[model samples]
Target chain A: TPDVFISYRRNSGSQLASLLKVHLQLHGFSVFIDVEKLEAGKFEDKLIQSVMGARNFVLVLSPGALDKCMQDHDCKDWVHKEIVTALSCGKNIVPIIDGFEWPEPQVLPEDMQAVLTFNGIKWSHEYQEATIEKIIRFLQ
Target chain B: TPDVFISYRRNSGSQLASLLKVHLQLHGFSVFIDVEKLEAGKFEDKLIQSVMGARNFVLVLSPGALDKCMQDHDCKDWVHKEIVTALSCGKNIVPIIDGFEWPEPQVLPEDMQAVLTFNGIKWSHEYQEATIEKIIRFLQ
Candidate 1:
């Protein structure tokens, strides 16, 4: 079981999530990321399991993040899906907002909007140390 | 010049945008939407024209909206671009939050965060008549 599941978009938040995972692991928390921790075929089921069982959902958002979700009502994109599942299961959810700004509350789908209500930590550029400190404070 | 420019994702906010456009038109306001008032070639230049020159920029957001924006760092996706242009030019901007919950401010691209500072209206499902009425009130 992972203490943290880091969800990030490849172009935008993947690197940050990886970095966050590393810092979290060094701090003694087991982190789960699909880039390396994915399950058997049809990873969706196991992905759901990962999200369901994890203690915290750390969503990494970069610039232009969620642009696709806005375009496709049913895109089934993993990040949003992960968010959906995390929220539905009442799992702990927090956003690691990177260079991206948190979007206005009005634009997110009703299901995904809960992400806004949950206070998230910002992953400031060039401020990795402070960023990690912020995350650790929230994770525990 | 158009009175209102509707920038919307086809899947989530297109229908609502169309309805809003019609209502705005009836209210004696010329609304510019890429779906109908696009310019020649690549449409990028003309689209920029629409966004830069317009009196009001109305961005529509629905569920999963901006999902694409999160994935492609250099996507140059028209919507984000339109948003950037409108913002840079200091155009009057407002959001029409549809079914989507506004994303956290940090998740939006830093460039797009300005949308939150501006006031916006909500487009409710089945409460669309009230929705349009609200938009017109803000529009003038």
Candidate 2:
């Protein structure tokens, strides 16, 4: 079990997702990020089950992270499932938006639609230290 | 440049020295430990030069850490040189003692004699968390 679970689309937020894990671990918080720990084959089951153990969930919403989900609501992607799972479990859900565009609820699933309403922190390299500090404070 | 510099005898204090670096980094502090970053040779000059840049110096004094120093004051070792250099430049010196026997000032070098008067912390695996917390506070 971890103190924080990170969900990020591979191309868009992978670097930040990994960096965030290091920063969070520095503050004595255990973190779980899919690619960092996921073994081959059973990723979907592992992620969903892993999410259940974490106390907080961080969704890394960068440029293309949500575009695929917006294009097809019927598509059940890992990002979609992870977000919905976090929402379903009622973990402390936070969005770290790094250069993102929000799609309207018409394309957003009912569970993930609420994410647009949740407070989010804008992330960038210039404010990395401050952003990590804010994220640490939020976790506490 | 680092905020804290670690000085430890290889066999005795290496594990604790590494652990201290992890704990300090978690609090956003930069630390320098020889083995963690040292490239092959020129270690003596490197250690002496590195100590001057750091604000605080930690002397890891485990059971046999000081045995060689007490036996011969002429021996130029990394641990002794680091401690003496820290003293030369007036870095805040802290001794983390783990079942250590302090040598008399006569056996200790003139530069290293003041270490006995400096405030110290007793370290152990049993009180690891608390010891780390205290070390973090001391560095601050």
Candidate 3:
């Protein structure tokens, strides 16, 4: 089992997520990114097992990710479910913010409000290298 | 003399800040808003004193506010300076987000990173009353 589980939205955060996976792997940390780790049919089962068993959870917040999370009031979305699972499992959650704005706790559903308190690392176009180094340091 | 000091960008957040001042005043809390409370020539000196003396610091974030703040490398913007002062004085800083996204800490200056840890309240076109109530409750 990998030590870290990465949860992100494909439309907005996919590229950053992929690059992050590669960089982390290069640094010798086992990372589980859905596209790279799971087969088409094996995603759901593996997703649960990976998230539950991982020691660290990294949530990549890219543009539009917050809007996507808020669109579903029923909270049935995969991202929401993954976060709920991570919180329940008591894993260390690190939010990696790349070119995305943080959402206020009032707009989020009650269960996800705790994410605001977690210290997150931000990545922007201007400070790419420094941002990655900070993330690596945090994970280490 | 006020319990709360509201700092905001003029173009987007001024009207909302005014409304917030009225609402907070109605609830028996002493509120300080620049336009309503300050004389034309009394800005610089009074601003420093008010932010440092107030019990709570409320920042009104509107569209373009975060980007504008980030553009200043020296962190000399008035809003940035006010926030830095409030943080140094250990004042409770409440970010009242209106039509704007909360920014990530890594993109913020080192002194301002603690704003990420503050639980912010959001206001959109829909939740006017509820948003005001939430801020009021937080103050109470």
Candidate 4:
């Protein structure tokens, strides 16, 4: 089973997700990022099935993605359900702020705003290499 | 005093920090980020003052930031310290994964190993918006 699940939108953070997977695999670890939908041959069924089962759901947050979910009005989105389930399961759902601006705390709904203010580490770097290394080390 | 501190390595996660700052400010929050080494504006001092005075520190954990803090021995890189202090001060400390993986239970350090299973959120296009709202809601 893959140890980590990289959840991101295709148009948003896929590049970073792929780079992360490459780096982690080089380090002799199994990591999963969804680039292709199930219809595609590259669909990682095991990984998808493991999303709810995994120890933690690494959610990638971005302005575009956030807007889409709110606009869509359904929690059917992959990331939305992931958060919902993670919260319900009490899993270690680590919300990672991507390379974009997040909404202000006041505009934020009561539940999500608390995380931005929570004492947590936010990783931001334009460099793919160093950013990947730091993430791996922290997990180690 | 601010409710959250967006401490991140510059140029990497500046957008995220700025966006977070804007949102938080719009919502009636005092947010702080950046530490100027030699700027006349007393950036580091200002950041320290805010952190010392704030309720929580949202440390940005990128791949490089996490690695530097964990491997660096001088304690000069003290991301973990910020977390510990926030926790020690009776403030809620939550670690946002940003673009990182979850640390293995066996690999987590003594201080964190005990709570190694804590779930962190990842930053991708999928949940960025919903996640932000969720975080805000959590605080409320």
Candidate 5:
């Protein structure tokens, strides 16, 4: 099992997640990113296992992540499912935002509103080093 | 249907839940606390109904709450089950903590870690009114 499981949308923050994975691994933390490790077909069981086993669930909230989740008419999106499962497992949830303001609580589904409780760390183009260091500190 | 469903360990926070129920009712909120409204036997259906129907899931995290939960060796305790169900149904979860510190994220069961994401409001002996007001404002 990995120490951290990074959950992010491909269209939004996949690149950052990838970079973080590399850095985290170099620092001796086993990191799991779906795109890098997940095999095709019915991965829900594996996803749950990874999340339940991991020490931390890192959510990379890009500008479009909320909008994408909101637009999920049926709420069956992988990211949504991953988050719900993570919440159920009681893993340490860390919300990492990149140059975006936190969404209003009312705008989210009730179950998801709990995410606002996390004191989020911001990452932006101007301070990538500082932001990464903050995240590293949190993980450590 | 109730606007808020209070979940607490009978041994730890039941009295607080009961007190809050009275105050909430006086303020015009339809509240449901297990001890006051539930009868003996086969109440799972009713419990699920109450939780799913409520707008908020108010968790009273008093002293020993976590200890009580941990002692439930099978992990099938009512409070744990109630929280799992509430999360599944997408109910708004509001954690109310007293003087005790927040439990460590690692100490909780995997599925329950989502509780960490909720920004809990502290309610102590000195500032009960102000604390309750903050919760009331959130609910409203």
Candidate 6:
């Protein structure tokens, strides 16, 4: 039951989580991210509850996540699960890609192709403040 | 019209294509492979038209083609285009995995994900005869 739950992969989205957490915390937001409090096997249940309880789910979609084309015990699979849960619960998802370009739908699988319609923000450290400010405004 | 069109990345799918082509040919069906037929950019429009005219599209769905996880131009995008065209034209598609499993729908674009509901087979030398037989049966 946090205000915001940041869902990201450590390999591809570590920078994204670190940068976003600072912004949300300073704004008096209760943020749930793995770096501070991630326990093994707690991810799935915690994620399900967070989606049910939180205001928004922030997803960092990157090339590393997106390019991991197959389904396995990988970050890409987790992100896929997270998105499905969020969509099913009618929760809002804010997608941010850290410099990775979205591939065309025709070449991608149905889920990755489907998300292109939602639109995402391109990440830049220089504009991190402005980006966070905008997200905050939108969320509020 | 060929019995099936083998759609795959040239490098990643070369061995697969050779194996599949021989399997189908031995079973008394014509197979069309871009690498075997056309060299380079000799026939884009005609190739598309021929593909459209195909009775079955044997798509090679691999990690390289899905490209949601790793970067490889040899597979994801081209295979995607062929599948979309095959699907839209009311042509039958037979998805074949060379290796690596694809993501579930939550991670795919709407139309692309919808295609996954259609189960596919694996491209293995051991199961070639059975795989080709099933494909031909499906077409009929």
- Every model's TM-score: 0.48, 0.49, 0.50, 0.43, 0.48, 0.44
For residues B66-136, could you state the per-residue lDDT of candidate 4 as single tens digits? 55445444445545545545555655444455565555544434453423343444554445556556556
- Colliding residue pairs in candidate 5: A88-B111, A89-B110, A89-B111, A90-B110, A90-B111, A90-B112, A90-B113
DockQ of all candidate complexes: 0.01, 0.02, 0.01, 0.05, 0.01, 0.01
The CA lDDT at B60 in model 1 is 82
A40-134 per-residue lDDT for model 6 (tens digits):
78566766676677777777776667654444334356666666666667655677777676666565445543455453555677876776766
lDDT of 2: 0.74
Fnat per model, in the order shown: 0.00, 0.00, 0.00, 0.07, 0.00, 0.00
Candidate 6 regions exceeding 4 Å error are A40-42, A69-76, A106-108, A111-113, B1-140
TM-score of chain A, every prediction, order shown = 0.90, 0.90, 0.88, 0.68, 0.87, 0.79
Model 4: lDDT equals 0.53
Q: What is the TM-score of chain A in candidate 6?
A: 0.79
Show where candidate 2 strays beyond 4 Å: B1-140
Is model 6 an incorrect, acceptable, medium or high docking prediction?
incorrect
> Which candidate number maximizes lDDT?
3
- Model 5 chain B: worst 10 consecutive residues (lDDT sum): B64-73
lDDT of each: 0.72, 0.74, 0.78, 0.53, 0.77, 0.67
lDDT of 1 by residue, A1-140 (tens): 88888887765554355556656887899888775676469887888888888888888877767876664458487778888888888888878775676678767676787787888887543344687798888885
Q: Where does candidate 6 chain B have its weakest 10-residue lDDT segment?
A: B68-77
Compute the DockQ of candidate 2.
Answer: 0.02
Kindly list the per-residue Cα lDDT of model 1 for residues B1-140, writing each as its tens digit. Answer: 87788888865555456556656776799888765666457866676776676888888877776666653446387677778788899887778775566567776677767876878676544354576687777765
Runs of candidate 5 exceeding 4 Å displacement: A1-140, B71-74
Please state every model's RMSD to the true fold in angstroms. 19.3, 14.8, 17.7, 18.9, 16.9, 17.8
lDDT of candidate 5 over B25-128, digit per residue (tens)? 98889888776778768887888888888878888888767665664658677778888776787677778877557666668777777766665666767777
